[PDB]
């Protein structure tokens, strides 16, 4: 990890990350066969098996009764794309002919690759443990109609077997037929491994996904098709990580304020967040819910990314004298804050705030000065800005400094309007 403290804009760019981008959705279809459970009844008062039967039947029936701020823009588009794709494939599957074809394909095996009439190819899995149990053990155990059988083993086995079905029903009913994430009941680890190995991508991506399958699970989700006969049919929309090991970097900033004649003039870069490179294409991922780091690799979603121009990387070098319209917020009220960076921390504190750095060994090391200041992690462990203790990160990497008169201090700000929320740096300074 290489971090460069760009003192021109009180910002730090931390490069050395290896991209993991999701390029497509892989659809997996499940038929959680429940069995002929609605035809069975209990007629000897309360029992463990009666309670489990009532729970299952209620679950089934209630299941039948169901179904430019770039960050905002990007996350909205991402959620829209995900829901639209899931709903479209669910619509293609909801046809009776399509469901019958899927069942026929899965009739003699537990996994088959069916080409849907809509032209898309989707994997299919059959979760038949619950149906096999309900048909071979439960049905012949509760004969006549007596659920108060002496065998407690049967009741406990029923509870274990229907755990998955009841959990799936809970998730779908609570979320109204669309879960936000893949529980371990929607798709187990082995099933996720099989779906990863069946993905239409290359060996490197497949191996990386085999290693980060729980990240895959975090980024996936599920959807309920419907209840057909006595079988719950749902699908899982898994993410395809078709790109791996590509350059990426993150930008952080803090208010670069400068006092003169008792008044201040602050600025804050609004183009913060993650970036990545893809075969001559730089992609901005500005919304804060889709880009997660894990060590050196950064996982992001390409549907939530904006295709920014290449040139945009010049704001990290000569933001002041670059022809790209770099984005910055502006104002005249100082804000004192600590903007923690991956390897260091930017400390801003001005009139009326006291700063100081330290460590667990000695409370106080020194009293920081006024203005923006880069505190290296190797230098200290914690920093204070007024009874507020921030603990620095302990990641290892070389920290750099890029000397240069800060823009806030070197230019005369625009008199009116000064407070601009998100504008080109031209409008604010040196207008």
């Amino acid at each position: 990890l290489k971090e460069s403290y760009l003192e021109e804009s009180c910002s730090t760019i931390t490069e050395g990350y290896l991209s993991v981008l999701r390029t497509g959705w892989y659809t997996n279809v499940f038929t959680l066969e429940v069995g002929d459970v609605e035809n069975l009844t209990c007629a000897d008062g309360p029992s463990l098996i009666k309670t489990e039967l009532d729970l299952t039947k209620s679950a089934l029936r209630e299941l039948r009764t169901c179904s430019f701020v770039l960050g905002a823009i990007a996350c909205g588009v991402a959620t829209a794309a995900a829901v639209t794709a899931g709903v479209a494939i669910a619509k293609c599957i909801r046809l009776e002919s399509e469901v019958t074809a899927i069942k026929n394909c899965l009739k003699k095996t537990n996994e088959c690759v069916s080409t849907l009439g809509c032209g898309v190819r989707v994997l299919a899995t059959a979760v038949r443990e619950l149906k096999d149990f309900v048909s071979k053990n439960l049905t012949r155990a509760i004969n006549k109609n007596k659920c108060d059988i002496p065998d407690l083993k049967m009741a406990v086995s029923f509870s274990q077997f229907n755990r998955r079905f009841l959990n799936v029903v809970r998730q779908f009913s609570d979320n109204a037929g669309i879960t936000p994430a893949i529980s371990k009941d929607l798709m187990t680890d082995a099933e996720l491994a099989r779906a990863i190995s069946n993905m239409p991508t290359s060996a490197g991506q497949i191996k990386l996904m085999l290693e980060n399958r729980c990240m895959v699970r975090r980024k996936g989700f599920g959807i309920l098709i419907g209840v057909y006969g006595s079988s719950v049919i749902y699908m899982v929309q898994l993410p395809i990580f078709g790109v791996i090991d590509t350059p990426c970097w993150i930008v952080k900033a803090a208010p670069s304020c400068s006092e003169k004649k008792g008044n201040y003039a602050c600025l804050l870069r609004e183009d913060q967040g993650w970036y990545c490179q893809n075969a001559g294409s730089t992609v901005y991922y500005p919304c804060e819910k889709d880009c997660e780091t894990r060590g050196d690799h950064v996982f992001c979603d390409t549907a939530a990314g904006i295709n920014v121009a290449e040139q945009s990387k010049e704001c990290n070098i000569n933001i002041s004298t670059t022809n790209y319209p770099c984005k910055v917020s502006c104002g005249r009220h100082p804000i004192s804050m600590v903007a923690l960076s991956p390897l260091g921390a930017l400390v801003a504190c001005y009139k009326g705030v006291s700063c100081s750095i330290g460590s667990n060994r000695v409370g106080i090391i020194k009293q920081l000065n006024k203005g923006c200041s880069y505190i290296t992690n190797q230098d200290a462990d914690t920093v204070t800005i007024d009874n507020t203790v921030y603990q620095l990160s302990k990641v290892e990497g070389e920290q750099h400094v890029i000397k240069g008169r800060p823009v806030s201090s070197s230019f005369d700000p625009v008199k009116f309007p000064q407070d601009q929320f998100n504008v080109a740096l031209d409008q604010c300074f040196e207008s």
Partner: antibody
Amino acid sequence: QVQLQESGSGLVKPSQTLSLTCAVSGGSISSGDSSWSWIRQPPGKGLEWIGHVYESGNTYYDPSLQSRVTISVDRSRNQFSLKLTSVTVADTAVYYCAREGNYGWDYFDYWGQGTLVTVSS
Amino acid sequence: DIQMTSPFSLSASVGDRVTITCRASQSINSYLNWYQQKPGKAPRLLIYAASSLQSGVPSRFRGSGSGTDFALTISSLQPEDFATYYCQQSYRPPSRTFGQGTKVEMK
């Protein structure tokens, strides 16, 4: 902390292919600085840059030497190597591996000792 | 590939004003670098951007100038400041050519 140490064959027969390698101790290639670059210094003239590679795999090469150079990097072993073909008499010099000073986009901050191949007869 | 004209060598005494000049054919803007190499040793990065001073370098090495004039100056020469000083261009890779080299020796 960081020490680039050239390695290879000290005896290279004439008309063969030019092979070179570099290493980094006390640091990593995969996320080092980047731009693991290469250099040669022919007797008579000065220093000349051949090409470099990045921690991911981007590989820039000299316009008037890129037809023969294939500079590769290996993030696992932490070594970026060199491969120069069509060696001539003018290609007898001191070759250096180095690390780049990502100020604007590239500058040199670290150099190796220098691997020299001597021809005696 | 590109040839630049500069003095072959220069001599002076300790504490003299040492000035160097590195010419370019195309354009450099601010992507110019300075290296010092002793005999039998690798070059040393002293200035990056032609105006930024690398950490841990004596203040004597400095570079100023605006417009069309640029040059490296050494005000307080030191006994360990006798060596060949190249220059490098990082404008438009992969065209990165060092200078022929300038050597400073005592008189």
